[PDB]
Ligand binder design. Sequence first.
Ligand SMILES: C[C@@H]1O[C@@](O)(CO)[C@H](O)[C@H]1O
Ligand SMILES: C[C@@H]1O[C@@](O)(CO)[C@H](O)[C@H]1O
Ligand SMILES: C[C@@H]1O[C@@](O)(CO)[C@H](O)[C@H]1O
Ligand SMILES: C[C@@H]1O[C@@](O)(CO)[C@H](O)[C@H]1O
Ligand SMILES: [Mn+2]
Ligand SMILES: [Mn+2]
Ligand SMILES: [Mn+2]
Ligand SMILES: [Mn+2]
Ligand SMILES: [Mn+2]
Ligand SMILES: [Mn+2]
Ligand SMILES: [Mn+2]
Ligand SMILES: [Mn+2]
Lengths: 419, 428, 421, 421
Amino acid sequence: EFRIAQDVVARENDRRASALKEDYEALGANLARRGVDIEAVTAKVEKFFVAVPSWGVGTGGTRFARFPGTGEPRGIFDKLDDCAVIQQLTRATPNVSLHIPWDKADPKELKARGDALGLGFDAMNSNTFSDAPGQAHSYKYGSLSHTNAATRAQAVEHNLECIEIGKAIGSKALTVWIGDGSNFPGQSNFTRAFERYLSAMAEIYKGLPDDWKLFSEHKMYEPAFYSTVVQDWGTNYLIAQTLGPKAQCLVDLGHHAPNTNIEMIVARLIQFGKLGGFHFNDSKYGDDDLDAGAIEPYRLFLVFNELVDAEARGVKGFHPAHMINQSHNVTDPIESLINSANEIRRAYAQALLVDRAALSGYQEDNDALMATETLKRAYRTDVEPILAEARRRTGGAVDPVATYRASGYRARVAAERPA
Amino acid sequence: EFRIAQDVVARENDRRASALKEDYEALGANLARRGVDIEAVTAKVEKFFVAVPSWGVGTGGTRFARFPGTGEPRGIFDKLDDCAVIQQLTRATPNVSLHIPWDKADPKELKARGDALGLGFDAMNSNTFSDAPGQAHSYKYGSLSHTNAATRAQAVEHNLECIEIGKAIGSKALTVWIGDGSNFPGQSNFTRAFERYLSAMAEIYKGLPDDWKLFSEHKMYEPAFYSTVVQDWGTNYLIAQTLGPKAQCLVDLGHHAPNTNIEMIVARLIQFGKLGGFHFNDSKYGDDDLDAGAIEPYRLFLVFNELVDAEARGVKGFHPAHMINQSHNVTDPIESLINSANEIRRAYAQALLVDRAALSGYQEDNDALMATETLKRAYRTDVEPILAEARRRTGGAVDPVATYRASGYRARVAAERPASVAGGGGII
Amino acid sequence: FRIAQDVVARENDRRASALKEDYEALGANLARRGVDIEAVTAKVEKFFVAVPSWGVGTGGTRFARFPGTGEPRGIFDKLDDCAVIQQLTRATPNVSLHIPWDKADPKELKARGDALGLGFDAMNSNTFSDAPGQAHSYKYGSLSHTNAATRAQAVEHNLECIEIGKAIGSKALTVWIGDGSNFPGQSNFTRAFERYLSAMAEIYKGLPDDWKLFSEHKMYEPAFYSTVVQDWGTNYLIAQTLGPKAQCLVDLGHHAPNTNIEMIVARLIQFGKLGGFHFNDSKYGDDDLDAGAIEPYRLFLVFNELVDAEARGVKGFHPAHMINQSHNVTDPIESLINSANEIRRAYAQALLVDRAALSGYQEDNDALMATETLKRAYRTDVEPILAEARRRTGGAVDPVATYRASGYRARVAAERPASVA
Amino acid sequence: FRIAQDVVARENDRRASALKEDYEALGANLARRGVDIEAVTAKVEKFFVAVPSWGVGTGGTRFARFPGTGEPRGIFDKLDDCAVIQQLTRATPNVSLHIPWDKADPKELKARGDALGLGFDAMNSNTFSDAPGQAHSYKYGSLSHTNAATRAQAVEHNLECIEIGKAIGSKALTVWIGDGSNFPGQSNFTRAFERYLSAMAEIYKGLPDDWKLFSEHKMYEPAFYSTVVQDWGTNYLIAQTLGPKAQCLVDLGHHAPNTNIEMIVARLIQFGKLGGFHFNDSKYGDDDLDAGAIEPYRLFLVFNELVDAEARGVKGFHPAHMINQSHNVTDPIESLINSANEIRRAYAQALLVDRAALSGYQEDNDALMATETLKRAYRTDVEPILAEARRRTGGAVDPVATYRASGYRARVAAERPASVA
Ligand SMILES: C[C@@H]1O[C@@](O)(CO)[C@H](O)[C@H]1O
Ligand SMILES: C[C@@H]1O[C@@](O)(CO)[C@H](O)[C@H]1O
Ligand SMILES: C[C@@H]1O[C@@](O)(CO)[C@H](O)[C@H]1O
Ligand SMILES: C[C@@H]1O[C@@](O)(CO)[C@H](O)[C@H]1O
Ligand SMILES: [Mn+2]
Ligand SMILES: [Mn+2]
Ligand SMILES: [Mn+2]
Ligand SMILES: [Mn+2]
Ligand SMILES: [Mn+2]
Ligand SMILES: [Mn+2]
Ligand SMILES: [Mn+2]
Ligand SMILES: [Mn+2]
């Protein structure tokens, strides 16, 4: 089925078709002069997918307040319905990331709804950073690394349950992010807490299917404000290496210390085969969870530059999971996810334009200026025509947000859902 | 009234009296050899007070979750009862800061309960960073600087109501902290938003009694994640200078960019007569709101060093409002506030030990090493005996938290108040 | 001509066809967006940024300096090199001098400038290092030093900078000092600032009627605990205290991690104290890297504030624009060329912003479309506009390629002896 | 003896009475706390930290260097000054050399060391700067340079450092390089690291059976975009890859803002790769300030992790301790004296932590009492312990006071020619 009327999509596409043809043909000619086939780029772009977070479909908030908009989803099924719009218009978000227990519901019904909407499911996300109804042990002082054996056991069991749910809907990975840490010096013994965490994760790994991957995710701080067990990529590497071949590291762009060179972390994990996936978003201060590329678009391009270089270097078996992990506090969640998915494809497309042979030459000759200008020649290229054409050719909209607004979807769900 | 039984306080004090006498006498002898009269220090420490936040006695949380403890206060009345315990045991927190509309209630009752508990009221706190039930205009996109005139008017009226409540309870100041800002480049026109904020604040200023002060509080980020209207002390100064004599700047320790020299900001505000007050807490990453001094005790000392320097140079018209502004997510709120107030008095006491004459001499001759060592000689001094003796002589506890736990207060209120439930924090 | 005209023409012709195709395509796209590319190119052709005399030589860190070939031996060699940057980019007609590094007969400096087609921007004083024969050391400070005689010496140095500037055509003095402390207690924050204010008041008295005095803040380095002029708040206090001729200079790399710099720019403009800019890029500290090489969007956002000021009708707004960088691992001339290009790039994109649309989205709190409105401008590849601007004004379509084709570096390497001691 | 024995004795007797009072008072307080002050003093007396030979000379920034009087020039003058620090603090018996700065006949160095009562700690190689006559420049890197001959030259230099070390009593080589990039694209992150690992493997082969190889990470400077060995994660990969003799060196000021450094220390210890420390303090970047002058609690928290290990004697836990600072505005000897003091101070306080009580509060999740347990130790003024340890071992009760009373600085100023009177 189609959440957005096909006639609206056709209408809004035809309205912008002439201009797109002009821009696409112009870009094609420019690229041809640069020895690049625009068709080959568009072909790869229409194959690039990034998962949308079920929890980012509703309006997000801070510890100070939540300001919901109209037609907020009542649950996971409404969320899937809204995710269907993002995929229909961008054609870059075929899979949805579920969060348990936030999205707990009959797995069979979830799969049924997903299939009907043309949506698949990406990595499952466990939640032991908050307490659920009737929970025997609280995670106030931790979960997988809690000092209490029974609490760690309960946390392990929760993760295994997430795996069961995922196996029923077609998910092939479990992402584990916990808030475990301390707010005061001395509250936790750094090493003992990490030892407890490794032991618990070993139990989860033992219950991990052999066609699944286990992603551990580091974060410098929040909710813990003094120390965090899985605080950075170094600790994360130790975890993945210790657990096994199926265990890898997930890199969330907003989880690093100020000024960190994140693209280098990406390169390092790839070199040692532990880059499991990404959580895309942008930020300026902390884990701001803003729309991808809205603050620092070049950094996003530089991360993708390392991914494309890995392919160019001949790295094998490298298929990192791509997921958006954002909070939309002051915009229509659907529009933000739409443009964020767009921005990720934008950075990817520009990375594909880098003249790898030229760059390699400038790197070997230590021609720093031309090496950086080689990256800029790709990054400065406005690939919007490629992104728009890719969408058009695949059933999407030339201008996703414009078509979304022309459809009146928000007003529609606002009337179908409570205030 | 005595939230904590006097027999328990006396008992727990006598149990530690012998050791305290020994430590106090030893420190007194050491200070004497250093030309300092311990009695003079203790006398000033007993008179140093810092306000406790009414909302601080309840367990706090993050956007990810909240894990309330037992006996959580139901409202302002329960909160005042808990604050009374902090004051009784530390004798450093006689005043409480209210937040509206969280603590809205009959002013007469608030004053009556405060007087009965031996508590006064510090600066009022307005709230236009969240929406209340039945509110006509949302603050989602701002309040005092919102693009919608009616929304700014509503925010102004709210602040004026806070002043009215404050006058009725004995308060003499209004602290204004808003989340106003943007999460995306272009969303807000920096200049126009600030102009709107200034115009609205001018209206609030007009409602200030002759003996009141208006404190604007800067914050680098959160809830706004790209830009914030009142983002730093520079913008804050422009605000205070523009509004008038009654307008000053409030400095919250955890509201600055990484590595910022906060003690210099304090000095600058004092120099230009705009240091309105402080919001004490500690942090390591962002506006962590941790227990004061639990992370960087020396920084707290350095801030107080600037305060004592001004307090010693007879800086006239210098009465900065001191307040604790913390969130207690993994401890008993009352215990943390107790030790936080203690740490603040600790930093103050150590600042009092600094040999100002010696320091000035080393500054003039550019003797950096001895200048810094002069501060360290004061900071390295364990003033706990002075803090404990000050509490003992004023009706407090030698060891506040030990006495608190010995009284069984938490278990008591846990049995009198309804149970709470853990839940999310606001992310979804 | 530092670079042979036949080389510039040859390299321009080689790229003319492609430039025509790209410029005409961009023109059509902009026309569809309601923008006149000719109007934008006409404005870009007139955007100038000053080149630092000290940036034409290779820079270094406290750990090492690795000079290249043909390093300029003095200010005259430096001006000759700056002439190359102006000839090829046509965006750097003025040079910033630093005293005493560039001390020389003002008449000779002026004569060399005129001969090369170069002017002089704001003068820069230096009381963050000791020169020979100095009666007092600046080890513990200069304008804010505890010793009155030392402050007096620093004041006289700044006045000498003004005298030199008056003779060569300069109209402003930029004052950046390292004054601060490395240890808590070493300095009395307030007294040090008062000392600074008194000294600057004396320097202000020496300013001609049409001159400006720019004070520059910096969070740290060389002082690692406190710095007298540490941020824009202190800087504003200085400017407001000194008078109408005193304004603040904003150096992009002098702010705390994560600082919203573009907002500082907006605040200073609102209160009429934005004197000028020191452009460069950075990732960690005051890295002094080529402008826009690290965070091109931030550079655009700063220019967005500058263009908005013009749109709001701010009167008498003529901020000074200067590049302040250190080239440690590249040919200084090439980096300055591309840095000047990046600055014009950000400026050009700022001009493309549909502010009519932006104002509507801001009023309606449509954050998504507001940010997308800025992005539609920023995502636009304005290189064809920059290249055409150069073609029309005697510059090179591809400045660095032309510079390399000219063999200029090898030429000066053969003419200039490398320092041995 | 660099410092006259009569001066040391005189300045000790002058402060003996007060010390007796303070030491006894602290001893009584600790006894009421179940702690034997003597056990602490005995351990403090044996805690040593190496002094950098280059640390006794005045340091500077990229903007300027302001030398003091009697600047030591050459390793011999430097060792003479280092001897003063050891004589007065008794906490710095070993000196760390830096090659080629300290190049000299090994037999002569060893002889001078023995004569002054000084030993030698880890050797430090230098491939972050170019020495005269050098065949290949390190401008674009050293061990990870793209040019094979340059990497070979860097490897040979490090092997030479090992040979010098073997001749003087050293048992480790610390490798810190500036290798990195200033621009995105300049370096291929992975290939540069591959080259580094291969080059380090060659240096590893030259290590005697009882030697250690310490690689040191640094976020930035001299590289301002990326650094090959940028953090502890990369450092761990290096040490684990090279072998048992390879470990990581943690320099306090080489981390990103807000980093929890004590956790990094704990992680390295758990995996047996904590080779040693480079002590100093900072507020902004790699400020290289006097240890504990800015954040004394952080220093204590680092030592809390060390003592937690020293108490149990963890496998592979025998960290080398070294001071790595730059003294730009103080007498280098005085700063090193007080820095070594602060290091012993933090160690002594960490020794006071009631581990049993702490472990209990950690298991019960009593965060408030757990942190208060650390504070009870940290708030304790251990100066009497540090002073008594010095007095009992031939040092000075008040090191800096004795240093000034001796007139040493004026003495060496009279023996050493400055650049200018
Ligand atoms: C939504 C949650 O946010 C995190 O990035 C933690 O900040 C994690 O990846 C998800 O579980
Ligand atoms: C509790 C609130 O927190 C703030 O510090 C803002 O972060 C403000 O001072 C109070 O209103
Ligand atoms: C080159 C110098 O560098 C500064 O930016 C200070 O860091 C100043 O503007 C100039 O004097
Ligand atoms: C003195 C040098 O400084 C470093 O810390 C690098 O910043 C290194 O450890 C030493 O070689
Ligand atoms: Mn994430
Ligand atoms: Mn996150
Ligand atoms: Mn506050
Ligand atoms: Mn706050
Ligand atoms: Mn500058
Ligand atoms: Mn600078
Ligand atoms: Mn080091
Ligand atoms: Mn260093």
